[PDB]
């Protein structure tokens, strides 16, 4: 039709307009020129300044993909074989074939959707979805164009081969058997080494639970990853895809619950104010910055400062440090709480998934099982905070296999065949109950879990509270329950300025009172809630480093290590 | 054979001769049929140094001398 | 529709048959061929070293040529026929059915081919995943650690018919031989084993090492065919 | 097959954390591989042997969980003698609290975590790329003991092997 060719004329004149695009490609070719790796044939349009400058062509390519995209990449593809002279004749004939693909960015409006809030109305258009992935198939090829030659003839013909799965159109079905005799009814010769083929995979986006509506069943899509992106991400990745919500094959229109299989031709993959930042930063001057959000964790919960802190801490966390050599250093926090019941031990573990930017809720499947293997709840928790409650209920194989987990930050499958290592980059903290009913603090707290101390002893932090008898603990204990008959979002946003835009390093001076409180606790023998070895020095420069992220600096002092040393001598007595 | 296995094939008065868990020594003809590599079993079997061995079953330390081949590599332990 | 891609292989056969013939060690391909004829040798190991020397003396000389190294690299499953025709050429129905050697060929060693100033491609080891779509028909090397090792089986190439009507025998029911075609009357065809082409076939599956895995993924595997000898 | 840790670390090192957690089905198996270098499997009708050419490093805590100067040192592991007896340069890295000690082990962890450098500064170690080539190139030799001193090791053996008999008591 004659109108495609006045939309490709726009696209040439698109890349026109914009420069950045087009010598964007330049760029690649001398790229490619110099190395005569190859890049691969795509680049990344922005749809603003696609709208900014042709709005029908922009609205055109979201409402209507299959006419509107082709005659971009057709007025891509001739501009980049015109740009210059590829001079080489055999490179030439091979290298050219591929079309220019395109990718999409920029503000989606209205179909800035989710798998939940897409819909049968956005099908047969461009939308971009949110969500985590969940598994991922085998890449494998897909033929495009074929060649012929014909021995008694010597000249080459060529065939295509296209499909409504890759294709952004349905067009008339091609596949058939491969062809053996050409027109002039010669044997044909079969070139496998100049057929083109470009690879695919299906991924499955899912909904998050995250968000996801308690009491209804989840939303998911499928996506389809094509040529040099088919393989960008693992699953349980959180990502931004954007391609066609199509449909395929017929909703039992031809020979009752089968409907239309909507689907999304991916194309492109990308893993995921000013007015907060100038109130995260002033309100952090006054000189007691600290115990105002140590108060607002929980706030109805009276007591417990210490732990409030020591939460606190666990959230803004330490730095993991890497070395030249390879190594890897852990900088997350770990605490364990024990002790009677009716103490609000699993109301502030409730409350940690209430504040974490990302956290996992389970109790004691923690590691992955066997094939792909499941990601188990431990896995999960790359980048974020777990929460474990009743503890105590950990089999054997639990107890022995969260070690890797609690120290080295990472998990290792080991199981018969495939071995691979996962990021286990997580804090935990759990609590516990006495198996006997009753807490005795005349025995020590590997006498009463019945966890052992070679399990116990790796939490940073241990913390044993006891509701004691007296009247006046139990006056304000019921007091305070009995008068409920900075805000929270800003400590959040507090949380993730923090933890992101700020990484404290060490200097001599915090270095100066670490080692000398160290070496006085190896030195002091009176008993303790835990002999003390040199994990407790790796402790007090976390504590440090995670009080250095509160007070938004690059460096440390020595309130950070005052702060530190105290409270682990509180976990301590 | 070995833990391979191939299938065999057993025709006329040879049947009424092999049961699971016997031993055979097997002549046969190789075939292959679409690959199907298998025996026409063509028979089936269910079941100098003579003096070399007088001149070491009469000598003396016989006992000794097998006793001490068995393991070269181990003291003693008679 | 058509289009001419600058591939000759007129030249290219003719550089073969010049390469087999005249490439010194007398030529080294020729002895080659003189132990194939007495039977002393059944698998004929082509070195690309050898052509890309060839090319070396033939571009020193100021003589035309064709870089036939890097094409043979590029559709290597197409060159295999050719450089039989050309030693069927020069060996001291169909001539596959009497042909007791098999072609293999070696990659260009990187010494050779920085010593020579080209980019050799086909000796690097690769992974099955760096292995893309894109090389597909490319003479490539994967490095990895072999996971399963399938038995020997044979592998028929041409299926060989013999007609009792006419005693032509047709290669791959009904006898479609030029006697039995003009004839009202056709006999039937029965397949021959001893005729038929077949193959010794294996295959084996291949896995990624341990450090050229990304953290958090799965090794892939990729299979691999082994023919011949 | 399906390789596990042992199989798939087939001509290597495996390393094994928290080994005295190791089950009985665990640690028999283990017995084979010490000694044997190989893995006998009878499942299922199955009889197979598996090249089991490994390097077994394993690191424990005590069976009392820690080691206090009066402890007998055997009561704190959950280990057999045969185990102990296949094991060589068997350690016992017992801590004990010093002023003077963890001061240096103290000074030198807090150096790794300050600078991206060990605290040494007379001495730098060689990169693992180097390393790996040089330990490749040293596996390769073969080097033979001369008769000399293999009359030297029976001398030592007696030595040593006598000693023992006064100690265990
Ligand atoms: N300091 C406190 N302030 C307010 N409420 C508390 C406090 N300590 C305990 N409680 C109350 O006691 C109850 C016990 O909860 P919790 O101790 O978490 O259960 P469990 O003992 O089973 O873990 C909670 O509902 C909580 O409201
Ligand atoms: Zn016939």
Redesign the pocket.
Known sequence: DAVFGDRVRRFQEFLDTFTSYRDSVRSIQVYNSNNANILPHRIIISLDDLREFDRSFWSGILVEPAYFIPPAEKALTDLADSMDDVPHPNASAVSSRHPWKLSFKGSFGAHALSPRTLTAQHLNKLVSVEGIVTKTSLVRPKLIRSVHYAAKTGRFHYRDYTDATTTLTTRIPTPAIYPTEDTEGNKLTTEYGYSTFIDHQRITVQEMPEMAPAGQLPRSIDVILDDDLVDKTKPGDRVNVVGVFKSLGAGGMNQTLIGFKTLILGNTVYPLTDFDIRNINKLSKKKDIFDILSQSLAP?????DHIKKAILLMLMGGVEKNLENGSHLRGDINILMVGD?????????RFVLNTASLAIATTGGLTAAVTRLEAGAMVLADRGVVCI?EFDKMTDVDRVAIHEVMEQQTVTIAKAGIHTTLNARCSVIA?A?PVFGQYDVNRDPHQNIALPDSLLSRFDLLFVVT?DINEIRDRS?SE??LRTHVTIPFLRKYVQYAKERVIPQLTQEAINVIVKNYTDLRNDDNTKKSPITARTLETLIRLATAHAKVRLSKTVNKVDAKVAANLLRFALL | ETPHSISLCVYDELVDSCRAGDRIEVTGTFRSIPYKTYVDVVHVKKVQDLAKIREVAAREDLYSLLARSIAPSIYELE | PSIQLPVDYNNLFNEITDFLVTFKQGPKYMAMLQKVANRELNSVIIDLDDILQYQNEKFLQGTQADDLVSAIQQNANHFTELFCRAIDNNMPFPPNLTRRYFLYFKPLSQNCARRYRKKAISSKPLSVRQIKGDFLGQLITVRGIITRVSDVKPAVEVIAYTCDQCGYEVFQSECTSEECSQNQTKGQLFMSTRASKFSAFQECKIQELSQQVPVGHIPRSLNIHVNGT | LEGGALVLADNGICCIDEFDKMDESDRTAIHEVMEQQTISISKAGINTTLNARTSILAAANPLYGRYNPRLSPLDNINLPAALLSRFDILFLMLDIPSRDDDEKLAEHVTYVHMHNKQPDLDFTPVEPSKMREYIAYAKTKRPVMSEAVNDYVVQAYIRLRQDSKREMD
């Open positions: 109805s919960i009276y007591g417990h019941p009716s103490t609000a031990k699993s109301q502030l573990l409650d609590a109950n509701d204990i305070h329950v």
